[PDB]
Amino acid sequence: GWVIGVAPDTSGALALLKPNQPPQVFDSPHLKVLVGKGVRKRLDAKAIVQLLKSFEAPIGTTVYVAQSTPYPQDGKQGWWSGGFGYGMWIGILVASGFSVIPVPSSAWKSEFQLTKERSNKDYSRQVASQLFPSLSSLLKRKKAHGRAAALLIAAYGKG
Amino acid sequence: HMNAGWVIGVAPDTSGALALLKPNQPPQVFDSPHLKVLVGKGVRKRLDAKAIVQLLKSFEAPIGTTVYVAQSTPYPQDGKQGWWSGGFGYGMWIGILVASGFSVIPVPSSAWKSEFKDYSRQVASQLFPSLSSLLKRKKAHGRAAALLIAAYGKGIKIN
DNA sequence: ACAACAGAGGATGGAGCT
DNA sequence: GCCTTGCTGGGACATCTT
DNA sequence: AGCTCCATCCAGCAAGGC
DNA sequence: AAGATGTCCCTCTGTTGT
């Protein structure tokens, strides 16, 4: 009955929806790696695994993951990073026994009405705060983009 | 000190491979399990995460087994899909191996080749004569890659 | 049909309607 | 220090030679 | 089965703002 | 310690030859 939603970007998050128990959300653990000249922010695979096993989730729990579909105007590095975080989350989740279901980014706009007009400058961050009043304190800043995303992904899979 | 345990080399591309070097035992290689996924208007092969964790768990390797994975470093001339797929297979492999309890060591593609593309299969064919029958078709360059990455890994000292 | 080769580097997904 | 806009879309790695 | 529209990002690296 | 320079893939869609 558990539902897990994951925003796989380098500043994404993970949402956990245990039945009959209050909701949860976690920032995706990260680290700093040198890439050529400069440092880059990437997902910490080790810390992700320990965060997953700490859930003590039932075997075969469905995890809904946002599909990486960047735009043609985006740079090559954006495409590389997009597939990297997507594949890593898929790999971690499948190896950890979870059942993974990819989902597009436009999916949660179906049940939670949102359009290009009235752009989600903070619409996503506070529609998720509406569906989850317990996590209203975690979504005040604009940097909580990923936390709200993972919450909406999990809510989409729950319904 | 010299590494006495198992060493594993992985070519993370879609048609890559994985080489297993048990100490004083017949060396083995495996074509990376893939499956055909619908994307856009067509179909492309992508790494089968579920079959990969089934292959690695069939090894029953000691936890912390060193796995050397070739880094994905595409060219600027390559298309966005090339960059996306490059990071995807690289992230999925790292995610699977870390979640499976392996110790993952990224190795640049230049490092293991400098230790020893058209000739790579014959270099691995003579180095591993048992698997020479598998390195007859040049499409097995991914197999020779995993071998030479794994052979490079055993020469790297550990702690 | 599968392999080897050649050449350029590329959105994707979903809703709707024929 | 750590957000927040704002904006384009981007090699990375190693070996040399200043 | 097509075949129209029409929607969807994030990465990364600068400057400024709290 | 920085710069100059030269190397390193793969993806994807065709076409061609087994």
Author numbering:
A (entry chain B): 110 to 268
B (entry chain A): 106 to 221, 230 to 272
Provide the authors' own sentences about this structure as they appear in the paper.
Recently, mutational screening analysis identified the chloroplast-localized HJ resolvase MOC1 that is essential for chloroplast nucleoid segregation in Chlamydomonas reinhardtii and Arabidopsis thaliana. MOC1 exhibits dimerization and an RNaseH fold, belonging to the retroviral integrase superfamily. Moreover, we characterize a base recognition loop (BR loop) that protrudes into the junction and disrupts the C–G base pairs at the crossover. Residue D183 from the BR loop recognizes the cytosine, determining the cytosine-dependent HJ resolution.
After tedious trials, we finally determined two crystal structures of the NtMOC1-HJ complex at an approximately 2.5 Å resolution in the P21212 space group. One of the structures contains the active NtMOC1 and HJ with a noncognate CATG core sequence, and the other is composed of a cleavage-inactive NtMOC1 mutant (D116A/E175A/D253A/E258A) and an HJ with a cognate CCGG core sequence. The HJs in both structures are four-stranded with a 9-bp arm length in each direction with only variation in the crossover with either the CATG core or the CCGG core. These two NtMOC1-HJ complexes exhibit a nearly identical overall fold. In the HJs of both complexes, the CATG and CCGG at the branch point were well aligned. Four acidic amino acids, namely D116, D118, E175, and E258, coordinate a magnesium ion approach to the cleavable phosphodiester backbone, constituting the catalytic tetrad. Alanine substitutions of D116, D118, E175 and E258 completely abolished HJ cleavage activity, although the HJ binding activity was retained. Once the cognate sequence of CCGG (or CGCG) moves to the branch point, residues Y180 and D183 from the dynamic BR loop of NtMOC1 could penetrate into the junction and disrupt the C–G base pairs. Meanwhile, the disrupted cytosine is recognized by D183, generating a favorable HJ configuration, thus facilitating the hydrolysis of the phosphodiester bond by the catalytic tetrad of NtMOC1.
